[PDB]
Amino acid sequence: TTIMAVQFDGGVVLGADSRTTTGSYIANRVTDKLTPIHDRIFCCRSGSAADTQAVADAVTYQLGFHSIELNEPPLVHTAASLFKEMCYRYREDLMAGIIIAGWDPQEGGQVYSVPMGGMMVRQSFAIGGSGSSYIYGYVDATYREGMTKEECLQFTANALALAMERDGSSGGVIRLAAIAESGVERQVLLGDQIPKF
Amino acid sequence: TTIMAVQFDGGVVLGADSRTTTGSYIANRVTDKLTPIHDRIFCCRSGSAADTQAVADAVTYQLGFHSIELNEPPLVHTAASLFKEMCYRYREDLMAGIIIAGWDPQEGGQVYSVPMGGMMVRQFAIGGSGSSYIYGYVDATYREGMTKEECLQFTANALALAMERDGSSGGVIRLAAIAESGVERQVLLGDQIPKFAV
Amino acid sequence: TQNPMVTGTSVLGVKFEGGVVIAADMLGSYGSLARFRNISRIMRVNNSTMLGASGDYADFQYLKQVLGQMVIDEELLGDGHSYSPRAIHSWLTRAMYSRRSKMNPLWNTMVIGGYADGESFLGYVDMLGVAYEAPSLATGYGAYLAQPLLREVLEKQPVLSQTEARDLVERCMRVLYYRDARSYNRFQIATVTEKGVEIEGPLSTETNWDIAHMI
Amino acid sequence: TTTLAFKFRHGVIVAADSRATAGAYIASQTVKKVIEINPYLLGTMAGGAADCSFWERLLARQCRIYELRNKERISVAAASKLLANMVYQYKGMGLSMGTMICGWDKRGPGLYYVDSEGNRISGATFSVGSGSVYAYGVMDRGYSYDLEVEQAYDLARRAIYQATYRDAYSGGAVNLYHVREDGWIRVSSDNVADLHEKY
Amino acid sequence: TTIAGVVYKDGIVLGADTRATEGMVVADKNCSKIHFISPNIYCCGAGTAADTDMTTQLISSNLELHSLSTGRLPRVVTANRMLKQMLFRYQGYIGAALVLGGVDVTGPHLYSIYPHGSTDKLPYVTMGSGSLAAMAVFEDKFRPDMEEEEAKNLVSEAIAAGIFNDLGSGSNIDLCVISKNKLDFLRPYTVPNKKGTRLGRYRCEKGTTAVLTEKITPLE
Amino acid sequence: RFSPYVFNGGTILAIAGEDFAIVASDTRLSEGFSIHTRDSPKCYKLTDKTVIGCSGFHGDCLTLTKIIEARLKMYKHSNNKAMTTGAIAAMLSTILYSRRFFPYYVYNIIGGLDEEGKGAVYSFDPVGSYQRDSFKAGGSASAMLQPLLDNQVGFKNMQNVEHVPLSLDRAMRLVKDVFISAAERDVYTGDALRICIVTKEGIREETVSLRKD
Amino acid sequence: SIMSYNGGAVMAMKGKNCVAIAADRRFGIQAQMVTTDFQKIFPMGDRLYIGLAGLATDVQTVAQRLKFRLNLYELKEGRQIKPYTLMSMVANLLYEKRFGPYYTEPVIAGLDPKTFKPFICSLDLIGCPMVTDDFVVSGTCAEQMYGMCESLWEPNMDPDHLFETISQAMLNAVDRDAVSGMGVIVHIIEKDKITTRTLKARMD
Amino acid sequence: MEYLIGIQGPDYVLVASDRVAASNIVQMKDDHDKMFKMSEKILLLCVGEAGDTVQFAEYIQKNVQLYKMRNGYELSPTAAANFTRRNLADCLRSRTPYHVNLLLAGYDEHEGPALYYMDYLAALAKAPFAAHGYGAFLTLSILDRYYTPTISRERAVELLRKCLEELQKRFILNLPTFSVRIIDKNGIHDLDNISF
Amino acid sequence: MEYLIGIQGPDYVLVASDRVAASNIVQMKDDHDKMFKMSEKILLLCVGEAGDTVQFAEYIQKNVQLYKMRNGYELSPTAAANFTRRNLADCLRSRTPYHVNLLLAGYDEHEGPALYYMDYLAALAKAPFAAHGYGAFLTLSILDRYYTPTISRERAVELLRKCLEELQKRFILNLPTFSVRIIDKNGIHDLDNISF
Ligand SMILES: [Cl-]
Ligand SMILES: [Cl-]
Ligand SMILES: [Cl-]
Ligand SMILES: [Cl-]
Ligand SMILES: [Cl-]
Ligand SMILES: [Cl-]
Ligand SMILES: [Cl-]
Ligand SMILES: [Cl-]
Ligand SMILES: [Cl-]
Ligand SMILES: [Cl-]
Ligand SMILES: [Cl-]
Ligand SMILES: [Cl-]
Ligand SMILES: [Cl-]
Ligand SMILES: [Cl-]
Ligand SMILES: [Cl-]
Ligand SMILES: [Cl-]
Ligand SMILES: [Cl-]
Ligand SMILES: [Cl-]
Ligand SMILES: [Cl-]
Ligand SMILES: [Cl-]
Ligand SMILES: [Cl-]
Ligand SMILES: [K+]
Ligand SMILES: [K+]
Ligand SMILES: [K+]
Ligand SMILES: [Mg+2]
Ligand SMILES: [Mg+2]
Ligand SMILES: [Mg+2]
Ligand SMILES: [Mg+2]
Ligand SMILES: [Mg+2]
Ligand SMILES: [Mg+2]
Ligand SMILES: [Mg+2]
Incomplete structure (x- = not known):
């Protein structure tokens, strides 16, 4: 797995590969690892598929109820907090690395990492999964402050493509999501659409 | 450790960090991991310091004697072969990942990887614990037909990036350029090391 | 080898009318890392025999060295005798069994393809000295993913032409690329006929990812 | 397995069952567990079948060479010592052997127990194998040195039979031998199912 | 075990072999691996036989309760959620590996469900020890929007690949075809494997077996 | 941790007749839950009147049969005659025992003619324990085959039955039947059955099809 | 092996309008025989029997706890249980202990108390049910039993032929098992009568 | 280890047990009693x-007495x-299993003598x-050899003595004395200790 | 377990050993001898x-005889x-160690009696x-209690008998008979077995 999210002015871009492995058998080659938690809040999932699906479903429930009570769009920070509370409390029973990214009217585009252990940190961009080792140098060299949305999509597509080449546990298609005030735009990069080097 | 070597037209560029650790204590912060094996043949050492020093010293002996017998400058491929034979034969007793790089009049600038297990492949090459972090970078940045100056820059950048992320890498960057005209060595320290924002 | 380091995945083989074809990708994996993406895992042994190897790449290079020297030695004599594919396969069986019995295996599974005396040869040798012949072979994940497809075609049509066997091998290599996480979309195909051994590559398969819009 | 042997006035009685098992599976009901070393020496098989057969066949070889070299048959004491010395070198390597060396020499009837653990002991009566405890019970209550020949046969036969009843790993047929001064004889071979009818 | 499912133009095709093993011995030659969940939803089972039996029975009865209450036809997503939430709670100790397929108001749906409680929504899936053989067939031959007969042929080919290449698979192929208009539970669909004829008869007469005691009890 | 052994499957059977011996095996070679090949016989001709069946670890089966073949020629060279069935059996006992501390993972059955022209069957454990048998099943499905042979050939548990000599025709029908039954239950036994009949005329072979699943 | 600690074998076999069930009689602890008349087949009705192989303590416990539940069922419902319902009741009992199971794998043999239709099944120790039309086996010599049953069984056997088939299957199977045997008991269930026989058997 | 033996005759059960309590290499008691009276005609022997x-x-x-x-x-x-x-089986998979081996010997007025293992x-x-x-x-085969269902109380005692003598001869543990009791229609009777 | 005992007096050494050869739960031999004659005035007792x-x-x-x-x-x-x-210590760290415990008893003409452990x-x-x-x-304390350096051969035998009786009473293993020998200026003498 490789997952990644980038903040820009007015929103976020999320990305993931689509490979699910049992050992070195690919059980699912078109996995969807970007899960919507609310209208403009997503999470990228890495680790145990059982764990991240269960935690995501639970947070969706919690944030949905919370949002109805308050009668307002939820904060991205609240979504991240709900993930952190579960991932921290059950750190001995979970293998889950989450990125929470989205837009709210209060703080705009936000990216939060909740790695294994259940710490929570806001970042300009975040990477996770087994495949992320291979692209630390790339993202550190390529990232620029003040990137547009189109540039963030390209930056994410490139980074994931590089990770996907090297990491046996990553591969398939690239799923991308852009989140802004105006809503969510999803796309898939497959075959020739995937950047080549 | 991060080690790296790049071929250009007319020679090679080698590079390494200078960190030697015992656990998470830095025993040597100015290690020299580029070892000369002959006039225009170097190796970059990663893994057990005991193992790579012992193997390097042994190959230097073997290649030096061989070179006198034949009365000719040794082939880089021969140096690589001598490393491969030892690293393969004693694969169960060694913890050594080697890059062999240099120049000979027959084949020019050459880079060989001899990873753990003792296989041998001609390639640019990266190795050490720190190399994980720069696979994406080198794959994206490498261009065919790079000059010597560009290879030095490419190597300095890649090592700098690896050194930032890998706790087992760090210190100074040692660079070597090898061509027909000889060996040029330099050290990048402090501000000389390429910088990237957090 | 007690512990394999850089490794290669599946090798495939199928007999056809007038020869044999084998295939292997060009990847050496270091655990999950796709580390060396341009290595050959196929060897021309002599004019009638070829060899492909899964497993430890260093151990493969050793066998290439040993077996390469063996064929050179025989050619020096110029006596009109030459190692048949069956003889190479026999030698390999003995060598692997010998190393296994010393508790120091060569960590490889191998496919020997050959053509001699108007007869196709296809043989398997594993690191424990298990050896046999079959009309089609597939090592590693190929055993689970490619061999069922190979045996399916050979059931309805035992005798394949060269082009039919080539199409079938390309189809299997596509499946392995889809389902084996240690595979790579860059492979070689080696063919042995009366004309000798040819090695083609690098080759690629075209992929389809339409099912990505079917969730 | 159940094997027994005992010295008495008229020589040495040797008896065995005939079952071999691989786990809980019965591999054979017709194993010959009394081994004919030479016309004057018998051995018995308990523990590992290959181990007993191989090493006692090696004993038979050595005993014959000895006879040729020395112009006289080997004593029971010396034969059992040869076997003990042979297997001692292999202690802790997982040999499984429990044997009785039975004969008649210048010292009269002879009976030694020899095992792969390194034991070598002379004795009046022995029983070896998984079923030995059950045979000891019967043999001990019936044994006498001054037993008559037919009484000795009945006791050996009955003791093995009772072992086959209780011990899952003993059964098949009861094979009975008698070592006399001029060599051993095969006395009888009775299926356990036939003995059930009788007793 | 080889189990598989495909989404075709008009619905779902589920498939399964019929071999059950205990160790490396065939215990059952005619085991039924396609389980009823509701009239519109079926489920193939691999893994621990008792676990898949009891798990599907439980969700089935819960879904009957659900649909008796709503008066509506159950949804595949409901079965999926109920299965995964229970399997997650048991942390993989219930060894149920399931291919869940059905047609509801939102159309055909196919899920794979693993013992730890992860699920995938997919156009084709395989499970069991024969799953890689079956998946080879799918990767080779699957097309979107297949006709009913094409999809049936593809699934039966996938199961057959498992039957012949996996020691854990054998005997018959069962199919289940689910559309909006019909349900075809085909058991068996094909019988590729048959016992050979007996060359000698062992018909023993009365008195061949020796009897020790006999007691006859008449009944009412 | 490297393991030098693997189980490759296979069932072998031998029956001794008055003037014949039968050695039979299936043709499946397995590993794990997979099939290597459907055409791998477990029977090997040693001489004109001796055949050996071998099952277990295929690596060891191959090695051992090559060792036996060599030893036969060596014996013929120094003794100026072919080895008897009994001599082969005795020799194999010592070969197997030579590896007592690193055994051949093999189950062997020898079938052929003795020096009087009578059928002889010898069965072995992996370390060379052996005896002469009237009939014997070995390998994967041996616990399935053996009880019916005890019943049908040995007449065990049967009252009011004449103990007739075993004809070749009845022996051949029994061999086919037990294998077809084994192919129903043992996952390792299938594909085809290879039968070797040893008589004074020579060795002739017959093959019957088994379930492919 | 926990299931081999006490040894034991049971099988059931289907005939024309009749069923049969048989069991060895040995109670042992590993190698040591303790008794030669251990009950392993229990009546669960006039024409319905359960046989249990495995751990002797669990054989007894499951028999007794199943009778408990069956007695209550029959009193409540005012009818005899159908064979398939007993199988379900047993499956339920065994699966309750999913995470600490009884070490017994039962076989059921009976006639439907209204149709007199033959029924046989077996269950694993956690209660997975398996219904067949031929035979079922359970115990430490399952392989030996499969070999005999596959060879001897024929469809639509009369009570006399069914008796001989299950007798020969059991005798010849247990004679290749060290920890099974010491006698065989056989019940033939018919519409109008039960016939119980003990066979002449090896006692080794 | 501890030794228990029971022999059922036509209208009686004879029981015996060793009288040693051992700890490590020493005998700590030589007059130990391993028999428990449940009722007038029931003994439980427990090791x-x-x-x-x-x-x-x-x-x-206490539960049999309460009944x-x-x-x-x-x-x-x-x-x-x-x-x-029931009690022992109920505790088998509980937090409190009891590692005990038992004989129960008894005489019922209607059923006659009984011995349970x-x-x-x-x-x-x-x-x-x-x-x-x-x-x-070492003793079960002696019982198998000599026992008949109609054995008298006199013979049962001598058959017991044969078993006990076998222990003296062949068994590696020092078991010099044994408790002996008989149950019949008249209840539980203490016989003489068998001593060596 | 095997038992060895030695008692050195003024001009003699008295030694005794059990006569059991055990295997698992059975005594296999009851007339076993654990004493080896090295020379005319030396016994080696080995377990x-x-x-x-x-x-x-x-x-x-054989080496003492060769000397x-x-x-x-x-x-x-x-x-x-x-x-x-020397021999036992030399083999201690070799491929062939010997797991033996020994007493050596002897009489020298010039040195008098000697007992080695x-x-x-x-x-x-x-x-x-x-x-x-x-x-x-169980026996060393009885020796400590009653032994004096001037103990006569008569008393030594009775003191040995006290030790052996203690084993009968208190020791958990069945050791019924013992070999008894004495060494003096006249060589090795076989005394009567002490039996129970
Ligand atoms: Cl997922
Ligand atoms: Cl929700
Ligand atoms: Cl993480
Ligand atoms: Cl992460
Ligand atoms: Cl991951
Ligand atoms: Cl993928
Ligand atoms: Cl030097
Ligand atoms: Cl390396
Ligand atoms: Cl390296
Ligand atoms: Cl390193
Ligand atoms: Cl440093
Ligand atoms: Cl490469
Ligand atoms: Cl080549
Ligand atoms: Cl016999
Ligand atoms: Cl000699
Ligand atoms: Cl002695
Ligand atoms: Cl034994
Ligand atoms: Cl008698
Ligand atoms: Cl869901
Ligand atoms: Cl499965
Ligand atoms: Cl209950
Ligand atoms: K990849
Ligand atoms: K650093
Ligand atoms: K089969
Ligand atoms: Mg070292
Ligand atoms: Mg027995
Ligand atoms: Mg978990
Ligand atoms: Mg199959
Ligand atoms: Mg039996
Ligand atoms: Mg306790
Ligand atoms: Mg030692």
């Missing part, structure tokens, strides 16, 4: 793990054997004779 | 691991004890009295 033996046996004892007080009549030997088995797993078997301990391995 | 005991003791025996044949006179008890220790590690100690085996735990 096994320290603590477990007396705790379990005395629990059964009598509550109902005005005693449990039959068969009812008592099943009660014992139970191991720590709680398998119950009715037997004409039975033994527990390592000593059983 | 421990099967095989090792007889192999080691007989090796020393006599080569030199025309015998090893002194002290020389024999050290020879034994050696364990399997090959530590050698001269002692006025010594014992090997689990039985030693």
